[PDB]
């Protein structure tokens, strides 16, 4: 139980022994593996937070070539005395950066790792409204666009306290599109809103009805209403989509939006838990045209892509849903990259997880990675995450799923 | 204890009893899962429970669970081991065992097919040439001038391990490869080290590009032998592409039949070492992983230059618009001459349909979503998109070590 990753392509052996500082479970039995389903999974006690803290601690001090120092014991000390006093913590600064910065390093599930250090952690633990909430949001947006030399961010409101005081961005991203279903037949903009876009109007939003309108914010600070806010539009980067071969693909009237920020997930630090907590970074290619464009259940832009590239749709075997597959994603990265917005390809983002993969078994003894969701949804087996064996398991501090927030507030 | 797979594309959820009939494991634990790790001598001892467990499924299955020629059977069966320290398989037995280790096969998409299995019972086999003939009426049948049939060779049960049947091929019909004096590779590198065997046991290679490697078998423990499958049995395909007229100027060509003969099949706790299984190729097998792997014939560049690709940016996606034409290619090759071919679109499709239906009227479906998803354009084939337990149920087909690292030579 030193266990090796061996890949396939080049025949580099791998050794993890970082698997063994796992805490929480994966879901798997001896009998069963549940590798592939996306969610295998009330306020904490105080019996329950201190082993949690001191975890958490001993890394951080352990980190910073400090283990078993005054230092270490006196904040161990300090933090034991807050938990024993106050029922809950205080997160230093500096150990809320490293906190966040390995919650990204632990993504078992994130192709885009190498970058983990390089987080730009902006403290919102100062905010107690909505309005300031969005405040905070919008220069999250504007730092992190930067004009589409795009930088990873996270923005950290208040920690839960007992549940009823819960600050939530609502939205699943900070930028996402609209989606309304038809009268007649299916839905325009985008189908994954369809609820959401509706939870807006229900809510007081009013929709231009098209097919790429910008949603609102709905921010929820210390567990009231959420309230509804437009994020200026100037700060909204978005990205016209062209072919480079096809002067017809213009008119097809895509676009799509620079940055992708996640604003759903639960940010865990030695067991304080984060319930809002959006973060950024810049796409991979194939996340928009493979699964934003192409998804059935999403734009599903594939029937009209192919018509107009005069492929025999009449057989699957002419392969007409790859060939049109692969211009749209060619004409995804073309577009990005001729408006100097950040991207990458899934070539040199899996590439660049190989050479991450490698330093963290040199520098840590291991990485914890889901080949479900490394491996691209286009090309696999071309890229050498394909080729590679990982190791899946989960460490901390980490991101989490959390409820819906809509099927929890006390509304 | 009930467990819930979802589709996240139709919504549709499936409930999984027959997980709990799984009593082998899977590598997994609750701390760490090896889902995409890709491989994770018996004495009458633990025998008659693993031929019980197998009986009362066959009984099951025909609906005589309990009567007195299951009971019967049961007795003998028993009896037959503590004299003789194994037992016989009857003929329905061992045609019930192989289609369901097929069934019971995770990693196989193919599955659809799996009661419409001939089985060929070569138990009485006793030397290598006998082997030998019963491999040609294998690949003649399975072969059947283009419109393939599945079928499955079963040679004699391993006794104790010391005079094991085994066929030294991978696979019965592969070409070879071979390694130049600089570092080039001729032929399929994938099997450079078993033609060296073939060339040290006396077969005079022709070294070239495609040549059909002869078969090595071994009978009973002994020292295995050499034998040539006549060529007017080996089916071939010519590679031509349906609109690039130079791309028959590749040379390229494959066989029809893909046919799996280094695995190891377990039906009641007997271990038949050689059981060579046949079906026919989805069309990704050749053209992703044959052609395209780097450590294969690896023929991308040449596909991607003749086709006069962008190739000095990998964001130009060259790799992945060279990869569709050249699965185009086999696809309209192998139709074009009658052979029998499915691709990844339809297969998929097919297994989605079968597992379904097998959650209907078996309780489960074992699934391994990393092997099941297709190499190329996952996201757009329907189990992308579907959630997929993974659990070991017997009979079923084993990996075995290769037997020139096992085998004692006779000389
Ligand atoms: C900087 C460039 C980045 C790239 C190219 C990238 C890429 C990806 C991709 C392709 C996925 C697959 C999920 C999907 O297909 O929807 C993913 C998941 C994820 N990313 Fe990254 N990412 C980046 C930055 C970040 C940052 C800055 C964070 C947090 C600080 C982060 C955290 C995550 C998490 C938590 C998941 C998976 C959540 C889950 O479902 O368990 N990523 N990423
Ligand atoms: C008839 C059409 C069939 C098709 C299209 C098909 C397709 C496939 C494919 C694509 C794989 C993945 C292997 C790879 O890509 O490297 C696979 C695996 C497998 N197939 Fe099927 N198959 C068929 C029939 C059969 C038959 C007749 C058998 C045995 C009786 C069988 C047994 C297996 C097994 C045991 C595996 C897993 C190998 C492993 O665990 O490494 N298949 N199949
Ligand atoms: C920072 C960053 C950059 C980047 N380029 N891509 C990212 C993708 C994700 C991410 C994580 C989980 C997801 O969930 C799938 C799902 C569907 S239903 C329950 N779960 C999704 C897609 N909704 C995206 C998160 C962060 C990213
Ligand atoms: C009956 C049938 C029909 C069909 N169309 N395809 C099939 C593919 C496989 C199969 C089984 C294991 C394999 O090995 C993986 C590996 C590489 S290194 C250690 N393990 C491979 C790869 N060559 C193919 C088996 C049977 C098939
Ligand atoms: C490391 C990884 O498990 C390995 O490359 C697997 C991945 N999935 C696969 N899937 C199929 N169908 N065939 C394969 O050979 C593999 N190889
Ligand atoms: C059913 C399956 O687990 C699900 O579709 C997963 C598969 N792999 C994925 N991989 C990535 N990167 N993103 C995803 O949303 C998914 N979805
Ligand atoms: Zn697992």
Known sequence: RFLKVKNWETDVVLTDTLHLKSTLETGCTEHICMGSIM???????????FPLAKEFLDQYYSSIKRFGSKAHMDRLEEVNKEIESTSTYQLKDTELIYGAKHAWRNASRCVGRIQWSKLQVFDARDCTTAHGMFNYICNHVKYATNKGNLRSAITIFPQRTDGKHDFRVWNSQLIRYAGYKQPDGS?????????????????????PRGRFDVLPLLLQANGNDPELFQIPPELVLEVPI???????????????????????????????????????????GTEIGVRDYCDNSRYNILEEVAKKMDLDMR?????????????????????????????????????????????????????????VWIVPPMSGSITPVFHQEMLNYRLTPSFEYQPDPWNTHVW
């Open 187 to 207: 839905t325009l903009g985008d189908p994954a809103n369809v609820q959401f876009t509706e939870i807006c109007i229900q809510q007081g939003w009013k929709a």
């Open 242 to 284: 062209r072919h480079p071969k096809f002067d017809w693909f213009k008119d097809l009237g895509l676009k799509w939006y620079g940055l992708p920020a996640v604003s759903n997930m639960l940010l865990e630090i030695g067991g304080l838990e984060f319930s809002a907590c959006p973060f950024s970074g810049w796409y991979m």
């Open 315 to 371: 057989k699957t075997s002419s392969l007409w849903k790859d060939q049109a597959l692969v211009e749209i994603n060619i004409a995804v990265l073309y577009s990005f990259q001729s408006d100097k917005v950040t991207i990458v390809d899934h070539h040199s983002a899996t590439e660049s997880f190989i050479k991450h993969m490698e330093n963290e078994y040199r520098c840590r003894g291991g990485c914890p990675a889901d080949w």
């Open 39 to 49: 969610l295998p999974s009330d306020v904490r006690t105080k019996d329950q937070l």
